[PDB]
Amino acid sequence: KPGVFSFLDPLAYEIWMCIVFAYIGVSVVLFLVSIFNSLWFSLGAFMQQGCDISPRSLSGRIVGGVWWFFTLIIISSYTANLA
Amino acid sequence: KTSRRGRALLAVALNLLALLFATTAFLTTYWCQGTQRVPFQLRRFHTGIWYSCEEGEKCRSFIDLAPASEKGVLWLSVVSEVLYILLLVVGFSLMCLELLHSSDGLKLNAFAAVFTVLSGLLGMVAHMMYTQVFQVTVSLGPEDWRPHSWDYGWSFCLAWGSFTCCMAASVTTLNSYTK
């Protein structure tokens, strides 16, 4: 039995670095709509579907939709891989 | 007022370091380590981003491999690097204009911050494109050199650091903007 690594097997570490950084890039934009506030809100975005509280379109809410689509895709591909 | 100024200069500083890392990516000493020892056959590759060194010592200017489409992918890659550098420099320029006002304003810093964002995004896309070309080259079996390692070149990590630093400067100058 592998320790830790076995869970990490389906998707490459570099890809993880990518999804993280890309998540950061998503994270700033919500604050661009407004150094930690809406960054923390983005932390409240990945946690649940994607984004909130935006008063109709505004700006980065569409980023929330794209992000939702995004994480949806990746988790799907992940699960398929483990399968 | 010392707070916003010190955080701002800290921001242009982080941007500057980030520029040094961008140059570092543009000046990698050798992109990844490599070896081929299957005797006779014994080798120690040290491929550059452009100058593929090997080790007696033997630096080599390969550059622009991976036939179909991938050359154009390198085109978009390098162009994205250039625009990356341009948005960096525009960031320094606008922030130095803020320094001229330190010697709109906030709207202008928001602009430069947006340029930092576009720079970081296009840059991450660029590094993606390059890793794509690299993995493709290895996938084609690069002429002879197909190293069992090639695991990573730290300068690239430094490029990612330049990214997170630009991110860090944009958000904090905007934190000053929040005030």
Added chain:
Amino acid sequence: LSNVAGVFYILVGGLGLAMLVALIEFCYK
């Protein structure tokens, strides 16, 4: 990484587009 990397590309493109929308919205005002 590639097969998802395309999705990274659509992601970043969406980012830049939304930033542009933010810009024109800053232009109305």
